[PDB]
C-alpha cells in the first residue's frame, strides 16, 4: 500500500478498535457460544429478539417462582446460544442477571456494527486498511498536543476527579483526541445554548468504540428491559473520571481502555437518589441527576470553551440517604450530546 499518513496514535487507535480477535475475546467473556454464535452470524433481528425476551424475564420477575421463570430463562438461551456443553445453564431469575445479560446484549449491539463495517464495504489492497477503516468512522479525529491549554485542563480533570474508593487503580493519559463526528454538531444544535450544558465522561469497552464513533451514543433499544439500566433507557455520564473508567472493563490481561469526554445539554435536571426506571422525563425537565454523596467542588469548576467543567476535587454534596457514592447524568434524547474528546488511558492496577 501507500502506508497511511495518519499520525500514530491515530493509527494505534484505529487498530484497536477494530480489532477482530478484541471483539471475539469480549464475547467468550459473555459465555457465549462462538460455533453456535460466531462473530459473523450476529445480526440486529436476532440481538432484538433476545432483548425482547429478557424483557419477558424482567416481567415474570417483578410478579414473582423457579417453574414458571424457567421456560423464559431458556428461551432467552435458545435465541443467544452461551457455552455450556451439555449443560443446564444457569437459571435467570432475578435483577441483576436481567442487568447483566441487557448488558452482553448492549456490547453485541456494537459490535455487530463494528464487524459490518470491516465486512460491508470494498476490499483494495493497494490502500492501507488503517486509512480505510478510519474512513467508515465518519469522524474527523486529530491529536491534541500535550503542550496545549486543553490537554492541560483535560488531564487536571483526570488528575483530580480520581475516587478514593477507586483506588485499585491509577491512570494514565496516553493520548487525547479531539473528536468531531460527522452530522452530530448540526444534531446538537437546538441544545448547544442550553443552560446547563457540562464536559463529563463516558467509558465504554474498546470493542464498543467503532459503533460509538460511527453511530454515537445511543439508547438502548424498544425491546430492551427498562429495569436493566438504573435510570431507565438513557445515555449515561460521570463527572468522576474512575465512575466512567470502571466501565472501561479494563484489568491485568488489557489494561488500555478508551473514554469520552463529552458535552451534555442537562437543562432542568430531575434530581434523583434511587433506582428510579423511568421511560419518559417528567414535563420540563431534561436530564436526570443521579445525586451523588460526593461530588467535584463546585467552586473550581472552569470554563473550557464556554462549557463547565466540573474537575475540583471531591467534597461531600450534603444529600443524605442516597444509593449513588457519585453523580450520575442521564440524557433520554441522544441530541443532546456532542461528543468532544476521546482519551486513552493506561490502567496501573495496585492488585
Ligand atoms: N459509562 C459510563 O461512563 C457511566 C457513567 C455513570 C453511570 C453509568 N452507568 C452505566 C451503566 O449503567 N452501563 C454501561 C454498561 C451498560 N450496558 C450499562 N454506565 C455509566
Given at each position: 500500500h501507500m502506508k497511511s499518513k495518519l499520525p500514530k496514535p491515530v493509527q494505534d487507535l484505529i487498530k484497536m478498535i477494530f480489532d477482530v480477535e478484541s471483539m471475539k475475546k469480549a464475547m467468550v467473556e459473555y459465555e457465549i457460544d462462538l460455533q453456535k454464535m460466531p462473530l459473523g452470524k450476529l445480526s440486529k433481528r436476532q440481538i432484538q429478539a433476545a432483548y425482547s425476551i429478557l424483557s419477558e424475564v424482567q416481567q415474570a420477575v417483578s410478579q414473582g417462582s423457579d417453574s414458571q421463570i424457567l421456560d423464559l430463562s431458556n428461551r432467552f438461551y435458545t435465541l443467544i446460544p452461551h457455552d455450556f456443553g451439555m449443560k443446564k445453564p444457569?437459571?435467570?431469575?432475578?435483577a441483576d442477571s436481567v442487568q447483566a445479560k441487557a448488558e452482553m446484549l448492549d456490547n453485541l449491539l456494537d459490535i455487530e456494527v463494528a464487524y459490518s463495517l470491516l465486512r460491508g464495504g470494498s476490499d483494495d489492497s493497494s490502500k492501507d486498511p488503517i486509512d480505510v477503516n478510519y474512513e467508515k468512522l465518519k469522524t474527523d479525529i486529530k491529536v491534541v498536543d500535550r503542550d496545549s491549554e486543553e490537554a492541560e485542563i483535560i488531564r487536571k480533570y483526570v488528575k483530580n476527579t480520581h475516587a478514593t474508593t477507586h483506588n485499585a487503580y491509577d491512570l494514565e493519559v496516553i493520548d487525547i483526541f479531539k473528536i468531531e463526528r460527522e452530522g452530530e454538531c448540526q444534531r446538537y444544535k437546538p441544545f448547544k445554548?442550553?443552560?446547563?450544558?457540562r464536559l463529563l465522561w463516558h467509558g465504554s469497552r474498546t470493542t464498543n468504540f467503532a459503533g460509538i464513533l460511527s453511530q454515537g451514543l445511543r439508547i438502548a433499544p424498544?425491546?430492551?428491559?427498562?429495569?436493566?439500566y438504573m435510570f431507565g433507557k438513557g445515555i449515561y455520564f460521570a463527572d468522576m473520571v474512575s465512575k466512567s473508567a470502571?466501565?472501561?472493563?479494563?484489568?491485568?490481561?488489557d489494561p488500555i481502555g478508551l473514554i469520552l469526554l463529552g458535552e451534555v445539554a442537562l437543562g432542568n435536571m430531575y434530581e434523583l437518589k434511587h433506582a428510579s426506571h423511568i421511560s419518559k422525563l417528567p414535563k420540563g425537565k431534561h436530564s436526570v441527576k443521579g445525586l451523588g454523596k460526593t461530588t467535584p467542588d463546585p467552586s473550581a469548576n472552569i470554563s473550557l470553551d464556554g462549557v463547565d467543567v466540573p474537575l475540583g476535587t471531591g467534597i461531600s454534596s450534603?444529600?443524605?440517604?442516597?444509593?449513588?457514592?457519585y453523580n450520575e447524568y442521564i440524557v433520554?434524547?441522544?441530541?443532546q450530546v456532542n461528543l468532544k474528546y476521546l482519551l486513552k488511558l493506561k490502567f496501573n492496577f495496585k492488585t
Amino acid at each position: 500500500h501507500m502506508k497511511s499518513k495518519l499520525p500514530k496514535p491515530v493509527q494505534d487507535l484505529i487498530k484497536m478498535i477494530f480489532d477482530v480477535e478484541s471483539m471475539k475475546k469480549a464475547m467468550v467473556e459473555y459465555e457465549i457460544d462462538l460455533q453456535k454464535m460466531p462473530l459473523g452470524k450476529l445480526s440486529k433481528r436476532q440481538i432484538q429478539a433476545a432483548y425482547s425476551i429478557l424483557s419477558e424475564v424482567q416481567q415474570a420477575v417483578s410478579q414473582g417462582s423457579d417453574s414458571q421463570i424457567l421456560d423464559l430463562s431458556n428461551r432467552f438461551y435458545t435465541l443467544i446460544p452461551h457455552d455450556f456443553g451439555m449443560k443446564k445453564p444457569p437459571l435467570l431469575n432475578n435483577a441483576d442477571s436481567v442487568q447483566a445479560k441487557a448488558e452482553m446484549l448492549d456490547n453485541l449491539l456494537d459490535i455487530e456494527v463494528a464487524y459490518s463495517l470491516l465486512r460491508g464495504g470494498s476490499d483494495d489492497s493497494s490502500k492501507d486498511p488503517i486509512d480505510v477503516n478510519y474512513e467508515k468512522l465518519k469522524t474527523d479525529i486529530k491529536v491534541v498536543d500535550r503542550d496545549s491549554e486543553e490537554a492541560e485542563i483535560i488531564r487536571k480533570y483526570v488528575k483530580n476527579t480520581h475516587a478514593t474508593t477507586h483506588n485499585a487503580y491509577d491512570l494514565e493519559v496516553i493520548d487525547i483526541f479531539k473528536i468531531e463526528r460527522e452530522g452530530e454538531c448540526q444534531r446538537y444544535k437546538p441544545f448547544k445554548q442550553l443552560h446547563n450544558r457540562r464536559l463529563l465522561w463516558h467509558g465504554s469497552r474498546t470493542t464498543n468504540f467503532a459503533g460509538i464513533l460511527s453511530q454515537g451514543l445511543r439508547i438502548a433499544p424498544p425491546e430492551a428491559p427498562v429495569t436493566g439500566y438504573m435510570f431507565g433507557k438513557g445515555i449515561y455520564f460521570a463527572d468522576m473520571v474512575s465512575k466512567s473508567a470502571n466501565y472501561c472493563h479494563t484489568s491485568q490481561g488489557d489494561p488500555i481502555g478508551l473514554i469520552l469526554l463529552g458535552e451534555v445539554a442537562l437543562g432542568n435536571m430531575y434530581e434523583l437518589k434511587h433506582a428510579s426506571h423511568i421511560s419518559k422525563l417528567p414535563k420540563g425537565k431534561h436530564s436526570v441527576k443521579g445525586l451523588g454523596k460526593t461530588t467535584p467542588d463546585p467552586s473550581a469548576n472552569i470554563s473550557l470553551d464556554g462549557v463547565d467543567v466540573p474537575l475540583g476535587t471531591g467534597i461531600s454534596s450534603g444529600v443524605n440517604d442516597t444509593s449513588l457514592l457519585y453523580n450520575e447524568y442521564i440524557v433520554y434524547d441522544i441530541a443532546q450530546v456532542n461528543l468532544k474528546y476521546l482519551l486513552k488511558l493506561k490502567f496501573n492496577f495496585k492488585t
